[PDB]
Design a protein around this ligand. Structure first.
Ligand SMILES: Nc1ncnc2c1ncn2[C@@H]1O[C@H](COP(=O)(O)OP(=O)(O)O)[C@@H](O)[C@H]1O
Ligand SMILES: Nc1ncnc2c1ncn2[C@@H]1O[C@H](COP(=O)(O)OP(=O)(O)O)[C@@H](O)[C@H]1O
Ligand SMILES: Nc1ncnc2c1ncn2[C@@H]1O[C@H](COP(=O)(O)OP(=O)(O)O)[C@@H](O)[C@H]1O
Ligand SMILES: Nc1ncnc2c1ncn2[C@@H]1O[C@H](COP(=O)(O)OP(=O)(O)O)[C@@H](O)[C@H]1O
Lengths: 275, 282, 282, 282
């Protein structure tokens, strides 16, 4: 077996993954896609599998696609990256399967956004389908607030930042739950509590079964191989899926959970892509 | 059976589909997604089939995704819109199956782009993955031009534009060939010649549409390509290549067809509505 | 005397100005700066006066500047357009002279902005220095709202949008007052009332206009403000304040006047052309 | 006398200016405008002089303007920042006075840009009026390259980044000359040479910085330029020209000087502080 690790900005995660490959005696090399171009050639086919780690979605998407063209299986796959990287696409797969999500209405213009606000009532959450580190997630309390948010989103220099995901405002336990799965296997979860005085959110949490099931069904449906899952507790739904990440960070995960994520990843790869 | 026609900007094409639905006695609604929101609900499940027609790529993608959540059969589907809407994703699928494409190198940074230019030599073509009416398709003559184009695309606000498709510059037949397929069957093709003061063939620049005699090699290229990407109602842009015969350049997942109609005499909307009636009524 | 009329989008205003020039028998040409380039040359010196009417601020600024280079007297001048087109610059000049403005704090970063909010308390108005038809004028009710607004403006293409004007929220007469001055003489004023229910009175969708008796306090406020900015043909936007009486909100250096005319029955174009003849004929 | 030093990102230059103030026994405060908001008041009037050093134009412009509102003399002033920070406004002031500049044509749309190219002939330089470390300065060799550049600028698509300055391509001695002046006094000049694979001298990794003997024609050119813009502490970028001798390309209102300092051995900060004391002590 030989693996290629695809990176652009090498963080602790990619170092850990590199380190895990070496000491598990896996043949590998690194291609830095911030530095090297990717031909549509046939001899990238020398790798049995690629670990897709670029820090930007377009780099992850396109490097996976190029490697796929050469017959190389990528973790994660280009289709999975396209789904996890877009909340509307993620919500669509989950909703179809009956996996709970925050109650959501999609609006694709300023006019539609106001109508969605009106259909949903206040308070509500409005976020775009892309990015963004808690960015552009707005808690909207009345029509005046909505109208100014609509105007600000309209003037964003990006097209997908203009689609609105209009959601119920979930407030129950004041925390975000993040989990990591390798294949169908849940490694663990930790909780991120909302800081004072915010409305928006690091300790290990014991995973009850209701949580484990929510997470495992979510990964199965998006076909994820190495992903994180962000979960919100809901008073009636129990647990709803908020987000999947197809290039998950795990330094904050490793410290809360004690799980050697990198080791689990390389073991997984050995089991499934060796011969 | 009932159909939703999803639109934002109503063009001749959308009017034609609407009229074709009415004239074939198909129960249809139109939902304008530049005006109305789309809830993730069971209610839209009242539609058996959605005809996805927004002009904007994000609007086609998301309207299709929401309708799919409700169990509606979308033409085209969101995964298909995601692939067709992106030349790198399209080239990736096509290359894997050995369907000819233009020789392409993918560069995802300024540094990587310069390397691709040097690996390839000049002149070359550099274009982004998304689509732009031939906007941002650059004929790069040298390193200076490459560097300025790199610099410009870096500063544009949506990161897909940071990915450079660095391609062979095809010079041969002096035209673009555009075909349409319905349910993986070729309807017809036409050609749009490069106007005399350019090197791109787009309608947005020039060239009247003229019918093409589709040979067997061209027919099979189209069918194989549309089949691999699973497009149910697509157009396919093909370039004639000195060595490869026909290479697939683009697939469009919300195909234009008023130019295609004048060149080919084919009632595209009629054939679409027949195909839907025949395959999704029960 | 020869006049150039500089336009990009021809509105009723520009038609009116062309008519008034023609009807007063003034030699004029029109240059559309969305169509035609402007050389730094001495050729343009054939015009004695330029009337600067492009709808975009940058086109007004730049066309004025190129005309000034050739020695043409521009109305308004580029210096004046730079000042009037920017609320921070305008407020600075007025404040120095003791001309009342809304109480304002300027914040040039996310951190400064949060401090400004907490310094003045809520509700408050937050707007950028650069106009936008009452867009991006936000009524900020709390810290959560200010934080999201800050986050949004951080991510726009124009760095001027990152400067926050953090203002007292004026609630008194439920209207704006717009006046027009030519050569530092007041023509008149009218009012635009806040529609129920908005916090902004802009034409879109500011039903309804009405009229106002200009008292001496309002007249002098307008004259003083227009004189300090050196505006030769401007509109000025005034808010009636419970304590300060009249405060200056904005000057417009390419004033609209279609609505001013319906309200006041004043021939703004005629007054402009007579002013130019009286002062610039030689 | 007391000075306020206005900063946002403290670079060597700012540290050096702070140090010079300290060593020369000058009472001074620092206000970091990336951290603190700026009220309109009378209290900032405690400062006799403000040294405006924010790294971003909007912060320099707006901090200067607020300080001016309080009666504080700013180095440089808001009007000077507005002129120097915009090459069209700079070229306009210089051209009116007969100070040589690169032959320039301003175009304010895609359509005008192509007409400007045709008027200018090839090769030409096209750059926006707003700085960017040689960003978006394009060397255009024919109409195809021109067409793709126009397309890329249109998609920026913010700012004055849509306005084109279309210039003669100057190529004589393969270098840029940069000078610094305090008041009307020229401190000196150095050259930045174009690196083997370039047309710009900024420039990531290039611009090997040679010291340069200031002749009288150069000195006249620089002094006249600084006189017309009323700069108090500026850099001036000059190009050698076969027929014009020297032309002014740029002025900078927040000049960098660590590189200038090492090329000329001029203690810029010291000279600045000496000048402030000499002039603003009272
Ligand atoms: N519908 C919602 N109800 C309550 N809180 C939410 C909701 N959506 C998002 N949040 C909060 O906002 C934060 C960021 O939202 P998220 O959807 O994760 O955007 P991003 O993808 O930028 O991180 C989450 O940590 C969560 O606390
Ligand atoms: N590799 C190439 N060689 C020659 N011509 C090309 C090449 N790529 C694109 N073109 C020309 O440029 C035009 C636009 O290209 P295209 O890839 O279709 O971009 P878009 O999807 O934005 O229209 C087409 O008409 C085609 O003639
Ligand atoms: N400080 C304020 N207090 C109350 N209302 C305001 C304030 N500032 C602006 N407004 C309202 O918002 C509208 C738009 O504000 P304005 O400053 O004129 O922005 P723009 O330059 O885009 O028109 C004004 O008509 C006025 O009614
Ligand atoms: N008209 C011109 N002719 C020749 N070289 C030019 C011309 N304009 C700019 N340059 C070159 O490009 C470089 C950057 O140009 P400049 O006008 O200074 O833009 P910026 O403000 O982004 O630095 C200059 O240092 C000079 O080398």
């Amino acid at each position: 077996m030989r693996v290629v690790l695809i990176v652009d900005i090498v963080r602790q995660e990619e170092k850990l993954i590199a380190k895990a490959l070496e000491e598990n005696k896996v043949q590998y090399d690194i291609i830095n896609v911030a530095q090297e171009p990717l031909p549509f050639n046939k001899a990238l086919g020398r790798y049995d599998v690629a670990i897709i780690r670029p820090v930007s979605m377009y780099r992850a998407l396109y490097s996976s696609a190029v490697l796929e063209a050469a017959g190389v299986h990528t973790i994660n796959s280009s289709d999975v990256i396209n789904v996890c990287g877009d909340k509307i696409l993620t919500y669509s797969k989950l909703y179809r399967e009956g996996i709970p999500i925050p109650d959501s209405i999609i609006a694709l213009s300023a006019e539609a956004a106001l109508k969605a606000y009106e259909q949903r009532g206040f308070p509500l959450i409005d976020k775009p389908p892309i990015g963004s580190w808690g960015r552009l997630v707005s808690l909207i309390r009345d029509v005046f607030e909505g109208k100014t948010i609509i105007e600000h989103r309209e003037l964003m220099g990006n097209s997908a930042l203009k689609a609105h995901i209009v959601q119920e405002y979930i407030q129950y336990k004041g925390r975000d739950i993040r989990c990591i799965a390798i294949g169908e296997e849940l490694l663990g979860c930790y909780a991120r509590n909302i800081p004072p005085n915010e409305w928006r959110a690091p300790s290990n949490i014991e995973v009850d079964e209701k949580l484990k099931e929510t997470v495992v069904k979510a990964v199965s449906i998006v076909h994820g191989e190495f992903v994180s899952i962000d979960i919100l507790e809901h008073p009636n739904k129990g647990y709803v899926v908020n987000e999947l990440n197809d290039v998950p960070e795990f330094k904050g995960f490793m410290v809360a959970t004690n799980i050697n994520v990198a080791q689990k990843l390389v073991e997984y790869i050995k089991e499934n892509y060796s011969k």
